[PDB]
C-alpha cells in the first residue's frame, strides 16, 4: 500500500523515488523518461516504481481511531 | 395416438377434447378450428383423429365437467360439488396467465388449442423440439423476486394471525388494539431467518450465502454469481454443459471445478438481467396499431396472420408483422412508453411475435448496424470524451438509438458482427 523501501529483485532503494516520479509525471514527462531520469535502468526497479499502487493515500482518508 | 392433458390438481389424466367441451364447446368444428388453423392441411387433421374417438361418451358440457371434476384429490360424491370443483379448477388453476376471472374461457381455449397445435407441429417435425438448456427458456430469480416470494407467504401468515386474533376477540363481543393485533415480529423474523440460513420458505436452501471477502475479485464474483438449482448429484450431464446461448451473458471460463461444474455460473461483464416491467403500455399501444384481438376475430383469420404473445399470453393477431416490428424497434430506440429491457422476438418460419417484459430475462448491450454502417459515429465518441464535463452519459447513448439490450431469445434472430471491420 506504500512504496517499498528496496527493490525486491536487486535491492536498489526506491522508497525515495516515488514522489520524484510523481513530480516528473506532473511535469508531463513520459513515465519511461521519468524512470530513466531517476536512474532506474534495470527493469526490475522500473517494474518496482512503475507497478506500485499508492494505496496509503486511500487509507489516510479514513479517520484515525484515536487522536 | 390420442392426445392427453395433465390438468393440475387432478389425480388421473384426461383427454384434451373433454377439456375443450368442458370449456363450453359442444360442437366439434370450433374445437378443431381452435386447434388446427389450416383446414386444407390434412396431416395434422389426420393425427388428431384418435383423440376424437374419445368424444363418444361426452358431448354435453355437464358430463365433461363431471369427468374432469370426479378425479380430484378430494373425492366428489354428488353432482353439484363435482361441477363446482371442475369449474373452480378450469377457472383458477389451469392457465392463469391467460385469465383468472370469468369471461376468459374463450381465451383459455385459444391458448390450449395453441399448445396442442404446438405439440402436433413438434410431432410432425414442422416445429423444432425445445431445448431445455436454452438460456432464453430460463429466468434468473434475482433478489427482487426471491424477497417478494418470501414476503407473499409471510404476509399471508400475518393476515392469518390477525384473522385468528380477531375471531378470538369477536366471540366476546369486544373491540381491541390493532397494534396489539398485528404481531409485527413474524415478518422481521421470517425475513431475517431466510436471509441468514438461506432456507427459502416452509424446500429451497443455499439461496443466501455469506459474501466472500477474501479479495475484491471474489466479492465481485460472488455478487455476480448465479446458481442453477438442478440436482448436483444427478448423472445427466446436459445442464452442466456450456450451452451456446451463454455467449455474452455468462462467463465461459468462470465455474467451480468440483461437483458444481456448470451449475454455478458467473455473469459476463456487460450482462444485465431484466428487472421486469408492466405490459399494459404494450397492450394499449398494440390495439392503437391495428392489433385485432382474439375476442373480435373470426377463427379462420389466423390461418395466414401472425400470432402476437405478450409475456407468454397470446393476445390477438396482426396481418402484417414486418412494419409492426419496425415501428416497435423504432419506439424502443426512441425511448418511448416501451422500455429498453423489453425483449422483441419474431419467429418468422412459424408466424409468431413474442413480446416479453417479465423479470429474470438476461440481456447485454450491443451496437446497432443499419445499411452495413455503425449508427455510432464520431460525434458520440467526441461527446463521450467530455463525459465528466457535459454529463453526456451512457443513458444518452441508449436514448440516441445507437445501442440496445438484446435478450437471449432476441439474440436468436439477430445478425451479429464481431467487429466493425
Amino acid at each position: 500500500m506504500i512504496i517499498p523501501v528496496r527493490c525486491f529483485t536487486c535491492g536498489k532503494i526506491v522508497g525515495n523515488k516515488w514522489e520524484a516520479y510523481l513530480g516528473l509525471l506532473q511535469a508531463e514527462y513520459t513515465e519511461g523518461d521519468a524512470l530513466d531520469a531517476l536512474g532506474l535502468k534495470r527493469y526490475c526497479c522500473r517494474r518496482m516504481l512503475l507497478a506500485h499502487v499508492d494505496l496509503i493515500e486511500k487509507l489516510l482518508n479514513y479517520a484515525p481511531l484515536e487522536k | 395416438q390420442r392426445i392427453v392433458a395433465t390438468l393440475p390438481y387432478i389425480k388421473q389424466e384426461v383427454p384434451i377434447i373433454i377439456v375443450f367441451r368442458a370449456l363450453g364447446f359442444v360442437s366439434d368444428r370450433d374445437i378443431l378450428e381452435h386447434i388446427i388453423y389450416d383446414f386444407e392441411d390434412p396431416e395434422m387433421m389426420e393425427m388428431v383423429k384418435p383423440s376424437l374417438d374419445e368424444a363418444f361418451v361426452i358431448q354435453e358440457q355437464n358430463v365433461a365437467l363431471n369427468f374432469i371434476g370426479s378425479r380430484g384429490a378430494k373425492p366428489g360424491v354428488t353432482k353439484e360439488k363435482r361441477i363446482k370443483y371442475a369449474k373452480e379448477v378450469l377457472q383458477k388453476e389451469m392457465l392463469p396467465h391467460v385469465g383468472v376471472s370469468d369471461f376468459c374461457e374463450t381465451k383459455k381455449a385459444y391458448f390450449l388449442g395453441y399448445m396442442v397445435h404446438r405439440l402436433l407441429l413438434a410431432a410432425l417435425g414442422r416445429r423444432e423440439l425445445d431445448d431445455r438448456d436454452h438460456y432464453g427458456n430460463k429466468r434468473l430469480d434475482l433478489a427482487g423476486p426471491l424477497l417478494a416470494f418470501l414476503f407473499r407467504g409471510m404476509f399471508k401468515n400475518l393476515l392469518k394471525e390477525v384473522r385468528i386474533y380477531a375471531q378470538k376477540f369477536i366471540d366476546r363481543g369486544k373491540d381491541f388494539n390493532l397494534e396489539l393485533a398485528i404481531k409485527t415480529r413474524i415478518i422481521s423474523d421470517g425475513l431475517k431467518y431466510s436471509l441468514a440460513t438461506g432456507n427459502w420458505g416452509d424446500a429451497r436452501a443455499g439461496v443466501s450465502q455469506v459474501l466472500n471477502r477474501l479479495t475484491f475479485a471474489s466479492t465481485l464474483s460472488h455478487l455476480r454469481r448465479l446458481n442453477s438449482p438442478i440436482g448436483r448429484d444427478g448423472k445427466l450431464a446436459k445442464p452442466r454443459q456450456l450451452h451456446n446461448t451463454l455467449w455474452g451473458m455468462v462467463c465461459p471460463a468462470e465455474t467451480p471445478e468440483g461437483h458444481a461444474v456448470g451449475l454455478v455460473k458467473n455473469l459476463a461483464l456487460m450482462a444485465y438481467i431484466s428487472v421486469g416491467s408492466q405490459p399494459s403500455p404494450i397492450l394499449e399501444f398494440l390495439e392503437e396499431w391495428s392489433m385485432e384481438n382474439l375476442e373480435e376475430i373470426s377463427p379462420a383469420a389466423i390461418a395466414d396472420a401472425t400470432k402476437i404473445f405478450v409475456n407468454g399470453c397470446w393476445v390477438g393477431i396482426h396481418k402484417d408483422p414486418e412494419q409492426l416490428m419496425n415501428t416497435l424497434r423504432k419506439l424502443r430506440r426512441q425511448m418511448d412508453i416501451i422500455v429498453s429491457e423489453v425483449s422483441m422476438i419474431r419467429d418468422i418460419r412459424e408466424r409468431e411475435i413474442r413480446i416479453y417484459t417479465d423479470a429474470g430475462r438476461i440481456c447485454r448491450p450491443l451496437l446497432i448496424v443499419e445499411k452495413q454502417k455503425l449508427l455510432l459515429k464520431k460525434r458520440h465518441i467526441d461527446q463521450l470524451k467530455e463525459r465528466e464535463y457535459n454529463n453526456y452519459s451512457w443513458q444518452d447513448l441508449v436514448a440516441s438509438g445507437v445501442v440496445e439490450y438484446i435478450d437471449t431469445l432476441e439474440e436468436e434472430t439477430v445478425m451479429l458482427a464481431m467487429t466493425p471491420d
Binding site: - | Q241, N244, W247, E411, E412
Partner: protein
C-alpha cells in the same frame, strides 16, 4: 517431448501450428441457437469456422468464436472428470 518427461506431439502441434477441431459429446459444436452455433454466423453454416474448427494456434491467438468453442470443449472434459470420479468410486468399493 522426445524425452517423454511431459507433453506430447499433439501439444506441440496445438501450440505451434493448429489447435484443431473442438468437439462436444464426440461431434462438432451443436446448433445451440436456431440452426447456428453463434449469432455471428449465418443460418446453416457447416464450414470449419462456424462449427468449432480453431484455425489459429495457441501462439497466434484464438479468435473469440474459437475461444468460446474451446471453452465448451474444456467444460465437457471437466464434467466428464467430475461424474467419473463418483461412478468409479462406487464401482471400486463394490469390487473390493
Amino acid at each position: 517431448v522426445v524425452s517423454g518427461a511431459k507433453g506430447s506431439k499433439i501439444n506441440i502441434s496445438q501450440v505451434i501450428a493448429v489447435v484443431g477441431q473442438q468437439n462436444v459429446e464426440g461431434k462438432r459444436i451443436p446448433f445451440g441457437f436456431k440452426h447456428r452455433t453463434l449469432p455471428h454466423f449465418i443460418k446453416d453454416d457447416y464450414g470449419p469456422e462456424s462449427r468449432g474448427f480453431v484455425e489459429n494456434s495457441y501462439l497466434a491467438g484464438l479468435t473469440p468464436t474459437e475461444f468460446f468453442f474451446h471453452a465448451m470443449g474444456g467444460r465437457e472434459g471437466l464434467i466428464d472428470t467430475a461424474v467419473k470420479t463418483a461412478e468409479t468410486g462406487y464401482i471400486q468399493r463394490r469390487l473390493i
